[model samples]
Target chain A: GSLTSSERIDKQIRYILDGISALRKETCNKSNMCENLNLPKMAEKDGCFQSGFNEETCLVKIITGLLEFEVYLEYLQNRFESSEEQARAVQMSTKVLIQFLQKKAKNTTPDPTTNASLLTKLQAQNQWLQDMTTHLILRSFKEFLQSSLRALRQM
Target chain B: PIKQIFPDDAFAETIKANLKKKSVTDAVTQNELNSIDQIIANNSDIKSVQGIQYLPNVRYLALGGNKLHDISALKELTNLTYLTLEPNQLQSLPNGVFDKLTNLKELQLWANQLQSLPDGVFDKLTNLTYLNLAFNQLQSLPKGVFDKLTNLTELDLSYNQLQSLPKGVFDKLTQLKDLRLYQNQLKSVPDGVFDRLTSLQYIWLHDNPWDCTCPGIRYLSEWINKHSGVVRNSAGSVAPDSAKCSGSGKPVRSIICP
Candidate 1:
């Protein structure tokens, strides 16, 4: 008749993943990565790509990126259940990545134990991360954001 | 007296120490103890429960947070109504190993390395009402594995690599009220998923790469909307609140049907 704690927590992670994957396409839709992600091309755009970049080969790169991020998030959740500090670190890192992907008005909260409420709150916020990676690609920009950018750079 | 049975075995010594700590009695025939219905040997560094079969009348068992890998010793504890083996090193179970546990009500097997469940592993657990299978490496589930759990009320299938579910995988779970299918790689659910779930009150379907335009989501979206309102008094459905499709990360309302 009811969902357990584990079920809700697991649901929250899904929303975050889906939210990011969907938002990632919008944020980076016209960049090299966007072309690679195969996000639907806007009318007459087909997304600007560097010479010699095959769409098929580039698509593999985006999938590999999502899979790698999946592992990181799964590992952080599984391995840090007993350590609040480490879990917070992981949550913080992803929060920054979310901001990097798209700074929605609401992307927040984490209680190391039972982590569902935050993601549920964010999902219910009806907000989407505004894709900012396109802006980053255009800027060649931001030295101060490097630390968190470094976090995702490894991915 | 587990130590007396295996004086030099370190694992046995740990179990003996735990029996004393948890106030569980040694079921020695001469000790005037005829029954020991529960055991709490958690976190005792035990890799095997080879001697647990001696207490065939056990009804409650807690073996969480352990290093144990093999639990074949529990096959004879037919009276067990509650059992927990979470956070262990288990990778698999023997076929038909739990076929005799018809009285079991709750079984927790979360946080293990299980990649798959053998056929008929849960066939005899018809009386089971709560089951937790979260936190494993499963990419898919065996078809008809849950067909006999007609009385199941809560089932947790979260936190794994499942990309799609087999059709009629949950058909026999008519009495089920809560079902969790979160945090997997699922892009679409089987079309008939909620067809037989008339008793369902809560469901978790977020986090997958759901194809909202597919028949699966289209059906689910309609079901959720149809049943989402209060029936007589209580909220009719709770899952649709956070049920977002994969592409827009927007609620199913905004991205799918709307």
Candidate 2:
């Protein structure tokens, strides 16, 4: 038995979300600087991603890009049901992900919560996050695009 | 002529009577003989029945819920195929106790006080398929102890003190379909542990101190989500719930790596 069409799409979306979650893991390294930080950063008490990419600003940009991509993807699926339109949506989604990748570390400010020396915390977090983001996050997103495209081809 | 090794509490007499009832008149000879093939002596309060070695033809035996701590007499039941000895007072198995039972198919030794299994104890049970060692005090199994049981399908090792599984311990269980490893002290499963388990359909991995935040967990979660069959741990079922990571003490599925 096959899944309902809606269920299939929903599952695909969930897989995409899972891939996104993986992207997050590969993009960031946890340390004392950002250990207990909240997503929407406030201050030293909130423990934001100090001295690096402002997560708050990065999130807003990524969400905006995702919202645009989502609208376009739906329009491609519902309004223009051509393979060409679907391919275009895939291409645009790929671009949005790349833009999302580039949005990290644009603005910076070291938070005041670090009990250790700023140099030590920054260097450690920077090294780990750099390796993770460069090696894992981008690579995972590349595979994610390929996978999503394959699913679209099936449709 | 066999001598009784324990007090006669009507168990041995009842067994003899049951065997006698199965005997029939001979065609040419005028002697009555019995050939017992099966016995159901469960909940019989049997403390001892040492003369059971005489029942060489018995193929199926059920002796659950008994007071017996020794079954050395069963070593000679060469024709035994199915044996059930659950919920007993057995603290340990005698070496070579199952050496002669080469034709065993299903063996149940659950709900006992067994803390260990002797090496090569099951070497002769080549045709075994269903094995239940659940509800025991076993902390570990001898390496490669189960390598020969290629035909095994269902294995229940739950409710034990196992802290970790030996790598490649289950690599030979290609025919295994159902495995229960819940209620143990397992902290992590090795990578590629279930890579060769193509026939596996159901598995339980809950009730362990799982380290879900480790980078290795990515593969595990991916496999659980991508497996063609069902992972019956807390992720799939709700009654008993699934496993949780010890760090956060939260469901492993809900873990978000920082």
Candidate 3:
């Protein structure tokens, strides 16, 4: 059922939100909150790029950005059988995360008090949404694989 | 016992890549630190909990809420720069707390049971900027309590028991910007108080027992009219009724200190 994938998506989404919260909490200070949450350090050894940019944070901005694009593709595929309202929600979510990622990459610091909570929530929601979109895409991919397998059997 | 929770080999690799500690800020929940870490704890009631332990890289420790009875254990946390001990029962600090905070820039002890600043308590915190001792039991500030705090930008000494301040206390405080001395037992301020503190932007003193009709009051009010004076808070402003004179019917702010 949709609920199964939804539940899994919720858990994954929670992890993503928690991750983003840590990233935003880091003040102008170049400290990371990964050790407390048990996530491995982003750049423990040398060779990390951008001087002080925690590669993990750089990746958080990266993965969330990539995940957002996947959301767009998923929404496009589901243009049929999806509500205008749901499509609008997806678009807004994508726009928000994309803007955040771009702003972070640009090194524009958001007001800590105001933007911290918003980013935390969005990261969680995005994670869950990504889960659902992945569930759907993977389902479709499996169906295509099975269909081709059957076609070869018939041949 | 086989758990499907464990992913297949390929999925396992991805999961390993995905699972990380920082995914959520520290789960244990530190209010001040931007990220999570093993909570730095303390003995029963030390003010800065992180001040007792060693959190090598932790940035901010929210020790503002704890009303500490004693904080000598914090002598160990030499690495702390930003610490909050606002609502604690810190009447007098042990001799060397500020001396040890070599890197401390901000120390907030506002609204605590703080009585008076020790003779040379803050002399060692050369790097200190913001010091909030407002709303405490500081009836009399020593002659040179603030002479050594050269880097202080904002100082909150309001809502205490200060009748008068020694001269030249703030002469060296070039960086002093906001000075809060409102709502105290200060019947009068020395004539040349503001002469040396040119960088003073705000001198909040609206709530103390101030005699309004006296000559000194007139002089102070004239300057306060242009300068940033202490405005009133919700409990109601202290007027001549409360700013009673020592002998005359006139309020302290109303009479001339002859």
Candidate 4:
């Protein structure tokens, strides 16, 4: 039987998580051991992926998170030593993940009233996240992936 | 550590509000300045930002709707990733004002009174992804002004007084996805100007005084025809029907050469 869209999304997320893990390992090996990371304050407080699975909300959060990761990784491409190829690889996975999530969101129809309001709030939250420094964004991305993995497994 | 003095009362008031301090005259330590990372001081009647240089840790700074013509103090905030100076009285920027901000990602300069930009002004902003220069009085851009902005994805040059663009101005913007050139006084685009923009998903070219009767418009007409799906109006809809030639009123996608 063909894999469902949810399963396909799960595989893509794993690919991105693996790429980030490899990049972080190489970075820590060259410099120092990686320190513990934290999620963005809003993400932690709102429990973006922790409470329950709302298809639209989850898709928006994941898509926005991956988009931020792509830009951050591009910045890291030139900043970190020997990280150009690995960073590009991660960005590719991130792009794939975002596209898949966008397709999934398009196929489903949530309440229009709630969707519009939720999107507005999420956009405002994203603007707040955009203000974070590059180092902060990277740290948050790691925490996002870990939480995403847990959420997917539970679902 | 010495207490930093804020000469501009409005700027100091804004800082005091962010810091939640009692008065602007109170002492502010380096540690206190380092703790703050973001400052939003829009429409506060701020004139001089002389004391903002002390906030070395600021990553996001927004001071829109002010009377700032000189922002040389921002050059010290090397950690800044997002900066906005929109709707200001900035007629011109001092050279090397943005040289040290290599980590900057999104820069918003729309709704300002900028008439021109210095050559190599954006030379070091390689990581910049979004740049908004709309609603300004920019007559022309310096050659190779955007050459170093290879990572740029969205560029808005609409609502300007631009009559023409330099050749190869956008040759290096391979990652560009959305480009807006509407509401300008442009007649024709130089050949190969839009050739390298392969990632372009949406382009707004309406309201420009395009000279479709001239041979210079042939390339744009052909390019528009080939990428009709990507052509959009100011309202973000794929409406090639809205773009018409200036004199003949023919659709831009199917311009007839005279």
lDDT of 3 at A110: 29
Native contact fraction per model:
0.00, 0.00, 0.00, 0.00
In the range B84-203, model 1's lDDT, one tens digit per residue, is: 665357666766767888899988776557687787778889899988787676888998989888889988786678888889898998888877776577877777777898888777
Which prediction has more favorable lDDT, 3 or 4?
4
Across B1-258, the per-residue lDDT of candidate 2 in tens digits comes to: 212422345455446555453322212111221367777665457666676765668887776455766567788888888887654677777778778888988887654566778888877788989787765777887888888889999887865778777788789899999887876777777788788888987887766677777586665666666652456643233322365677677766665444
Model 2 regions more than 4 Å off:
A1-155, B1-10, B13-33, B233-241, B247-249, B256-258
Top lDDT prediction, candidate number? 4
Task: Quote the positional error of residue B124 for candidate 3 in Å.
Answer: 1.2
Residue A91 shift from truth in candidate 2, angstroms: 51
Docking class of 1: incorrect
Q: State the C-alpha lDDT per candidate.
A: 0.54, 0.56, 0.46, 0.69
Which CAPRI category fits model 2?
incorrect
lDDT of model 3 at position B1: 6
Which clashing pairs does model 4 show?
Answer: none
lDDT of 3 by residue, B137-212 (tens): 7788788777777899888775477887786667888878877675576767776677667677655564455545
Segments of candidate 4 deviating more than 4 angstroms: A1-155, B1-4
In angstroms, the error of model 4 at B253 is: 1.8
Superior by TM-score: candidate 3 or candidate 4: 4
Which regions in candidate 1 have their CA more than 4 angstroms from the true location?
A: A1-155, B6-33, B214-216, B229-239, B255-258
